Each structure stands twice: as C-alpha cells, then as structure tokens.
Amino acid sequence: MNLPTAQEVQGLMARYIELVDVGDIEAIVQMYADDATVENPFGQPPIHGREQIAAFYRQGLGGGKVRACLTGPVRASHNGCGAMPFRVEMVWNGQPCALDVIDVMRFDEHGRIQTMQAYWSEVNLSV
Amino acid sequence: MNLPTAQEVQGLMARYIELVDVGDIEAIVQMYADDATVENPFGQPPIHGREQIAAFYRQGLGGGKVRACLTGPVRASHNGCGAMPFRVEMVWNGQPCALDVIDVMRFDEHGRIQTMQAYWSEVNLSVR
Numbered sequence: 653m654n655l656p657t658a659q660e661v662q663g664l665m666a667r668y669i670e671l672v673d674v675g676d677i678e679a680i681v682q683m684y685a686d687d688a689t690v691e692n693p694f695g696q697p698p699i700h701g702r703e704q705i706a707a708f709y710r711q712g713l714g715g716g717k718v719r720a721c722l723t724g725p726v727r728a729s730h731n732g733c734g735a736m737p738f739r740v741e742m743v744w745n746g747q748p749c750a751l752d753v754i755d756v757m758r759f760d761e762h763g764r765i766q767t768m769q770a771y772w773s774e775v776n777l778s779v
Numbered sequence: 780m781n782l783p784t785a786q787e788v789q790g791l792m793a794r795y796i797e798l799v800d801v802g803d804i805e806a807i808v809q810m811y812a813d814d815a816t817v818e819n820p821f822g823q824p825p826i827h828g829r830e831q832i833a834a835f836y837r838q839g840l841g842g843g844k845v846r847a848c849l850t851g852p853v854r855a856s857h858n859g860c861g862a863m864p865f866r867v868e869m870v871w872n873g874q875p876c877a878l879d880v881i882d883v884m885r886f887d888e889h890g891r892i893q894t895m896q897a898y899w900s901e902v903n904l905s906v907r
C-alpha cells in the first residue's frame with residue numbers, strides 16, 4: 653500500500669493494538685518501518701530501528717501477560733497520521749493495574765509506522 | 780508558573796477544554812503563547828501568533844453552539860507535554876454532529892500553550 657488514507661490509518665492503528673493485546677512481537681516489528689523512531693514514554697530518549705524496537709516490545713510483551721484495548725475511536729489525518737486512546741492492563745506489585753495511554757503515529761508511503769509517540773506517565777497508572 | 784509538571788499539564792489541558800466548551804475566545808487566546816503554533820487539523824498548514832489564533836477560534840467557536848468535553852483522562856509527560864481525547868458537538872446546517880478529536884499540546888516554561896496539534900478528520904465526524 654501507499655501512504656494510508658484516513659480510513660486505513662484507523663485500521664492500522666487498531667490492528668497494532670490487537671497485536672499488542674495478543675503479544676505478537678514479530679507482527680508488531682513488521683508494522684514498523686525498518687528505521688522507525690519510537691518515543692515511549694514521550695520525553696524519554698527515542699529508540700530507533702527494528703532491532704531496538706523488537707527488544708523493547710519483547711521485554712514488555714514476551715510473557716503474553718499484557719492486555720490492551722482501545723478506549724475510544726482512532727483519530728486519523730489526511731497525511732498518513734493518527735492518534736488513539738487506549739488502556740493497558742498488566743500486573744504491578746502483584747495487584748492488577750491499568751495504564752491509560754495515547755499513541756501518536758505517522759505512517760510512511762508504504763503503510764508502515766515511521767514514528768510513534770506514546771504519551772503517559774505515572775499519573776495515568778491506576779491501582 | 781514554570782514548566783508544567785505532569786499533574787499541572789493535566790489541569791491545564793482540562794482547563795482548555797472547558798474554555799472551549801463555554802466559548803471564551805479571550806480566555807483561550809490567553810492560554811496560548813505569543814508565538815504559538817497551531818495545527819488544526821493536523822496535516823494542514825500551521826498558524827502562528829495570537830491574532831491568527833484568535834481569528835481561528837473566532838471562526839470555529841463564534842457562532843454555532845459548539846460544546847466540548849473530555850472523553851477520557853489527560854495523558855501527561857514530564858517534559859511539559861500531554862495528549863487528551865475529547866468530543867466536539869456542533870450543529871452543522873441543521874444536522875446535529877459530533878467530532879472525536881485528540882489534542883497534543885506542548886506548554887512553555889510559563890504554562891502557556893506553545894504548540895498544539897489536533898488529530899481528526901471526516902472519519903471522526905458523526906451525525907447525532
């Protein structure tokens with residue numbers, strides 16, 4: 653595909669959440685451009701390229717324990733970009749916890765994620 | 780106020796929405812920095828300066844019964860930035876409509892909005 657339309661951005665970013673929820677690291681790495689830049693959380697030093705991205709996601713999702721689901725519709729632009737609200741559920745201190753996040757993504761002319769910024773901090777972590 | 784903390788970004792960005800909701804263009808322009816940049820919707824040319832920002836909110840808020848409310852918590856960083864999901868309700872040539880939007884904001888070391896990006900398009904519009 654080329655630069656995703658607004659409707660295609662909605663589908664791609666929803667698909668990314670489904671892949672995070674099932675914990676398929678390889679499928680996520682494939683969604684990213686080979687030289688993608690990721691800032692998670694935004695304000696922290698970026699990581700770059702599929703090698704660093706694969707390591708980051710496997711550290712986060714390798715155990716398959718995390719769950720993720722959209723908490724609102726994906727907002728999409730006409731220049732291949734979008735932003736989405738979601739909630740992440742995992743284990744912290746034994747008790748279950750929930751983290752509210754917004755990801756901003758820009759896609760390239762091949763339909764792959766070129767950049768991603770994940771906005772969240774401890775003020776978004778419940779229980 | 781200095782560079783807003785994460786908790787302070789949450790309050791500031793929530794404060795912006797309720798200002799949009801009540802339609803106080805004066806109060807909203809004051810929240811913006813003198814040389815702020817606004818991309819609304821994201822993908823179009825950015826606008827600069829408070830006069831140009833003033834006129835933008837005039838066009839959008841100064842007429843139709845525009846209301847706005849958060850549809851989720853404000854996500855805040857530790858570098859003075861945040862993102863929030865909200866819904867704009869409008870009446871568009873008779874048709875009651877709603878628009879789902881996510882705003883990304885960067886605040887200055889004075890607690891003013893330095894940059895704003897509003898993500899939405901027609902796919903996010905619905906008839907009520």
Ligand SMILES: C[C@]12CCc3c(ccc4cc(O)ccc34)[C@@H]1CCC2=O
Nearest residue numbers: 672692712718740742751753755770
């Ligand atoms: C890593 C993590 C699980 C997944 C996750 C987190 C934060 C932001 C994310 C953003 C994403 O786009 C996808 C997944 C996460 C959590 C923070 C702590 C934790 O357990």
Ligand SMILES: C[C@]12CCc3c(ccc4cc(O)ccc34)[C@@H]1CCC2=O
Nearest residue numbers: 799819839845867869878880882897
């Ligand atoms: C301008 C507008 C009303 C307000 C509004 C829109 C879009 C994005 C916004 C982002 C904001 O942070 C505040 C207000 C709006 C609408 C698009 C169509 C319309 O009438």
